[PDB]
Amino acid sequence: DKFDYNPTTIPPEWHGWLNYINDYNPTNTQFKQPTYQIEASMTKTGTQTCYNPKGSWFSAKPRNWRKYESWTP
Amino acid sequence: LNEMPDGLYKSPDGKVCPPSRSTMKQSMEALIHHFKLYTEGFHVPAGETYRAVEAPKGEFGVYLVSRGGNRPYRCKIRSPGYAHLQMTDVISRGAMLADVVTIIGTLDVVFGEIDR
Amino acid sequence: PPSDHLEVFVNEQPVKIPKGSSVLQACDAAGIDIPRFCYHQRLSIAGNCRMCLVEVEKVPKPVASCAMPAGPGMKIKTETPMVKKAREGVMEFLLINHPLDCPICDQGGECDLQDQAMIFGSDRSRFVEAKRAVEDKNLGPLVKTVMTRCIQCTRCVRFASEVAGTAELGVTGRGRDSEIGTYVEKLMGSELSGNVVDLCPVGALTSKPYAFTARSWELKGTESIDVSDGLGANIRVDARGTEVMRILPRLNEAVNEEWLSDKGRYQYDGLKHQRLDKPMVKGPKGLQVATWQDALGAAAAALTSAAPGEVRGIAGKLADAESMVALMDLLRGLGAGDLAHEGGFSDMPADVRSTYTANTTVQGLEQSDLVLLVGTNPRWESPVFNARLRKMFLDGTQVGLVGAPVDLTYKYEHVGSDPAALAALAAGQHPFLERLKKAARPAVVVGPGVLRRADREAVMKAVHELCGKAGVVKEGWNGFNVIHDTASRVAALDMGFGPSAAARARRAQGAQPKVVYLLGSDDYSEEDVPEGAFVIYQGHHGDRGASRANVVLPGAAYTEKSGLYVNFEGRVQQTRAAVPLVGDAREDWAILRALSEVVGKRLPYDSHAAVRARLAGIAPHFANIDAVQTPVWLNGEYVKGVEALAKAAPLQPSAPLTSTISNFYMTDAISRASRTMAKCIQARQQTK
Amino acid sequence: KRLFGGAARHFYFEICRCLPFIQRLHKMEEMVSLKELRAIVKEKFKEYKDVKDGRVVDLLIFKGREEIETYLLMHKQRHHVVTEVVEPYYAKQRAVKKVTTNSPFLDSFLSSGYAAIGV
Amino acid sequence: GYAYARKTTDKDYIASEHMQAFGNTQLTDYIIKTVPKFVKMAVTGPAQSSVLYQEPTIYTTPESLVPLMVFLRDHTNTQFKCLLDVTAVDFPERAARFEVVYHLLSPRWNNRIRVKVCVDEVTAVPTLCKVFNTANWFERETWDMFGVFFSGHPDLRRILTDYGFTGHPLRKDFPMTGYQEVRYDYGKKRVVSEPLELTQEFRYFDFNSPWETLNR
Amino acid sequence: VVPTFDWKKVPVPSTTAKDIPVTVKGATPAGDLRATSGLGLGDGIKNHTDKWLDGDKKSPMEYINEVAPIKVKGLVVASYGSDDPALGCPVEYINLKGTSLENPAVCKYTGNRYYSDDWKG
Ligand code: SF4
Ligand code: SF4
Ligand code: FES
Fold first, then answer.
1. Which positions in chain D touch E192 (Cβ < 8 Å)?
2. Which residues of C fall within a CB distance of 8 Å from D110?
3. Rounded to whole angstroms, what are the CA distances from C223 to C218, C239, C556?
4. Which helix (H) or strand (E) holds C395?
5. Apex CA A55: angle with CA A52 and CA A58, to 5°?
6. Which of B40, C54, D29, E216 could be cross-linked to B68 through a Cys-Cys bond (beta carbons 3.0 to 4.6 Å apart)?
7. Helices (H), C200-286
8. In this protein, which residues make up the domain named 4Fe-4S His(Cys)3-ligated-type (chain C) (predicted)?
């Protein structure tokens, strides 16, 4: 990405090599891939598709966090 | 760098120092001590002390008061920059405005330890 | 006495102890708290955990201090090298087979094994062999078992045999393969079956409704009272913010010792459902949310537009004394007199407090050698009181019963079942009268099902004649006791919450009210709430009384307020707020003071202290909290005074003296909303 | 003759001497007058009129002094005077004999389930 | 003004044998015998200077704190020239709930000592500004944090807390989060103090074991 | 004398009785009391996983249900959750007698399931 380059697009199997944490990359090391692994992509901050808590206005259904049930007649 | 010995780096009193992570996952006493040291903590016996260290700005000291609990009853912090900054009234007398910043710089003050 | 207190030496300090005390009790009287796992104050001595080992002079072995009696001039040492080596060795033996389960165990944070290992044990282990693994057991919906954590202290077995009386647990196998439980798949059927979770010192037996929800260090504990029955057991409520997480007993030897029934322990989950949190007024659409000003105005308009003789006020089973005196003063200020109680016998005369209270008290009943129960089932009315009756049975007190035959977990002599049998006992036809006449301190306990009867005055006259002939009440001993099963009844009798003579006459000729105030009432009879009347419901749960009302005023539960309650022995106790008020609810006496202001005749008190001072102005014993007076006894003058109530509504010698509690697990609006109580009933239904 | 050396009236005189400079520096010329300010500061003094100990009187005067120099050195501005000194006084003398016949209890009842904390 | 650089060689020693023996063993008895009216209680404990020794703690009345400190500064055997700090400890169970604590260091003989005065909330302690020049800011901080009044101070005013701050934060009955909080108001265009409200209240964890023996 | 009590004639409100939290087979008998706290009651959430997971995402409980029970020779098994004991859970010793492929034993740390054909069966 020449126009919107960002370090959050570096996968974790290249992150430790590029940050000088270890000397391992996929070209010399076979990493164990979990079946639930989510691939790395660019951050979504500043847009309206960012992470929000469950009590937020931007959620599909906001939560009222009451710990009791009210009586409805 | 030349006299670094081989051996333990932690005190072997398990009622003060937490165990290793392999020991905690294999023996019952280590897991109990891990659970208790990471929640209640050790109990310090009742008493008091003042202990000081030659910190790079001077003498840094802690006055610890113990009633016997797992929490300090009183912890007074003595900072050298607090005493060094008190002198600016007698050190800057007879100086000019462009020497105040030199005096403040040569006293070596950081306001985190001054303002606790 | 031949020196009834003997002197021993604990760490060279002289200690005087009563005779028959053990070494552990002598160490406790010296201010030393000896580690223990199998000893309990309320159970029999076992001596199998070997943690209480101390050193006695001229004995080459460590002695077990819990079991060893203390002799004269004995020298006890609790801090020698052999005592410390013994403690570390016994702890090491306790921990070799224990599972590494502290993260997933519910006792973590309040564990006797953890804390005693930290203090009296070592910091390491040398054990690298494989451990013993045990399958878990099913004991019902209230007790959860992870049996790999058992340390074979046999506290559960001794409890089930001695206090609960069911005797269903045992130790099967031998040696390392000893195993606690029932051999076949069984359900723990005792009403006092949650106490064994407290008695287990480890996480082998934990509370199933509470499981995995909280750690003990996060809980703010409040010392309150229990309102699920009339005994008023002393409890501690543990809350995390606005939510009550568990309820535990606390020590009171004059009331409940250390026990609590399963209803009083597990009904707290009904406080999270069907809660009234907003005021509502019935419109053409139905009940809908309204402001407090609007709801108070509607209630005041209905209370003022009706004639004073068309207003009735009914107190619930859980109303505190402050709200009851507020409602009583508000209705009497309007010229009304129709006061009713949901717990029945609202027209009962309350002139002398000794006639509706336990004169012997709960702890004073233990000095009785013969007990006659009249028409009561104490196992379902108050299981903690029935446990104290079993404790009295185990050390020699004989029990007889006149009433319907019931399982009481101890042997009793069935004298009869009807008031005809009571009259035959008073005349002399049954040999149990001669057993009562020769007893040093006989006792009579009358249950609330007798007072709910239409002919209760004749039955009480027969009981008084029996007590006069058998020496039940004499100089130095008063053995006449009346118990109750509802929390709010005795306070209402104390303050005078009863209907006037005109209101009793109007009910006799069949007058029907148009405005009914329901102070927390959900088990009212249909004769007292007519259809088409205006209903003001003040309460905390949405139930039968709130579905029928026109104005709903949300109040506080007993975990949210500090109200006064009096138990059946006459002791004034109080709740305390463990959580704040829920939603837009208010304090219960405060609603009635605000409503008296909106009506137009203010109550003369503006604070909690002032309404308590009004209560103390009516009856002065209300001011003495956590204490009980000695009530006046007027011999047969009181019975002579109410002979007109004996002549009218005559005796029914064929109707059996029964107990009115037919559903033990669901008695009020809180326990009816509890899912745990419903599972408790379903477990007893699916076993057939 | 005057209890504990008359130190209350001496401190009151000192504050009353200090007051017009406070009014000029904080620019409160068109908000409050010196007469009502003197009455307000007098009303601060009457709250401790029943102190039976002279050491408590000396401590109270020392603390009131330190309050008056933190007002003199512009370490609290005019909005601090508004929100802490004169509007509590005007609220305590403005709500007296209100236009509504509601008792204080019923206003508290309609406000919330609990009493108000602070100001 | 002591401990001038005198030896030009490396020194492999701390103190002399006779003076170190006197300071580590006999100093408590010496101070008690020479000035008995100044001393009301003494504790010899685990030694501020090092983990290997013992050092005294002297209790005195406020009426004799200044003469005792002058004696401890100027006497030839106790040359305590440096005052390291002044602080207080709150004991709400006592009739006099405060203990004002003074630490001292002797550069002449490598020693340390601790001096205590017990007062309540309304008893003044004499200032040590004339004896030690650092006593100024420490007494100002002690007045700020605990409300201990030091009589004879040149300018006793608060030094650490906020400008309008009433209340002494290090007392045991003062709340950890306080009573007021601070925000900007767009309407008043000023930073304003308001009564405290917390989005998440502080969770107090009560960890203490009912078998623990050390609690005093 | 002492007549039996009929529990089947005891009334239970229908709103309460239909809302009992129960369990599937797992580590308990199927249908026993499931402990719950108050979280999610205001939003009408009676399920454990729905209280923190939003959407049609695969739950952790559905992940562990796809791993078959493991055949172990012996009477007791030690569960670490990893090949390396330093990287897993504290060791759990799980009883294997009375177990089969249909009714295996489950680790309370990891949710892995084990059984043995060694208890004369
Ligand atoms: S009973 Fe539970 S909390 Fe206590 S030591 Fe055993 S595993 Fe840990
Ligand atoms: S289950 Fe608990 S009470 Fe029963 S023997 Fe085991 S450790 Fe003791
Ligand atoms: S407490 Fe005595 S042997 Fe267990």
1. 79, 83
2. 292-293, 594
3. 16, 11, 17
4. none
5. 50
6. E216
7. 262-266
8. 82-121
E94, E102, E95: which is closest to E65 by C-alpha? E102
Q: Is F41 within 8 Å of A65 when comparing Cβ atoms?
A: no
Closest C-alpha among C670, C676, C667 to residue C143: C676
Backbone angles phi, psi at C125, to 5 degrees: -135, 155
CA-based nearest residue to C17, from C79, C70, C77: C70
Q: Which ligand is nearest to the CA of C171?
A: 2
Q: How far is CA E14 from the centre of its chain?
A: 27
| Choice from C114, C143, C159, C180 to test ligand 2 binding pocket (greatest atom count within 8 A of CB) | C180
Rounded to whole angstroms, how far apart are CA atoms C478 and C361? Answer: 10
Q: Is any ligand 1 atom within 6 A of the Cβ of residue C202? A: yes
Question: Counting every residue, how long is chain E?
Answer: 216
Distance CA C143, CA E192 (A): 55
Whether C153 is in the pocket of ligand 2, judged by its Cβ within 6 Å, is yes
Amino acid present at A50: C
Ligand 2 touching residue C180 (CB < 6 A):
yes
Query: Phi/psi of residue C211, each to 5°?
Result: -65, 130
Give helix B28-37 / helix C112-120 axis angle, nearest 10°.
100
Which residues have a Cβ under 8 Å from the Cβ of E182 and sit 6 or more positions away?
A: E191, E192, E193, E194
Our mutation pick for probing the ligand 2 site, out of C132, C168, C202, counting the most ligand atoms within 8 A of Cβ, is C202
Pairwise CA distance, residues C322 & E209, whole Å: 39
Question: Which of B49, B24, B46 is closest to B37 using CA atoms?
Answer: B24
Closest CA in chain B for residue E84: B78
Rounded Cα distance between C40 and C252, Å, is: 16
Burial (CB < 10 A; 0-12, 13-18, 19+), residue E190, is: middle
Distance CA E148, CA E119 (A): 8
Question: How far, in whole angstroms, is CA E73 from its chain's centroid?
Answer: 17
Q: Nearest CA to CA, how far is C102 from chain B (Å)?
A: 7
Name the token pair of E190: 């000023």
User: Quick one: resolution in A?
Assistant: 2.5
Q: Helix or strand or coil: residue C205?
A: strand
How far is the C-alpha of C598 from the C-alpha of C596, rounded, in Å? 6
C653 vs C424: CA distance, rounded Å? 11
What method did the depositors use to determine the structure? cryo-EM
Ligand nearest to the CA of C156: 2
Ligand 3 environment, Cβ below 6 A: C 36-39, 47-52, 64, 66
What is the residue type of C511?
Answer: A
Is the CB of A66 less than 8 angstroms away from the CB of F42?
yes
Q: Is C477 helix (H, G, I), strand (E, B) or coil?
A: strand
Q: Which DSSP category does F22 fall into?
A: B
CB-based contact A69 F63, cutoff 8 Å: no
Using DSSP's 3-state secondary structure scheme, residue F60 falls into helix
3-state SS of F31-50 is CCECCCCCCCCCCCCCCCHH
Going by alpha carbons, the residue nearest to atom 4 of ligand 3 is C49
CA dist., res. C255 & res. C571, Å (int): 9
Residues E190, E186: Cα–Cα separation, whole Å: 7
Amino acid at E6: R
Helices C81-95 & B28-37 angle (0-180, nearest 10) = 100
Touch B-F: 3+ C-beta pairs under 8 A: yes
CB of C153 shorter than 6 A to ligand 1:
no
* Residues of F in Cβ contact (< 8 Å) with B26: 85, 90-91
What are the tokens at F80? 């670490």
CB E44 within 8 A of CB E54: yes
SS3 C263: helix
Euclidean distance between CA atoms F7 and C686, whole angstroms: 9
Task: Report CB contact under 8 Å: F7, C685.
Answer: yes
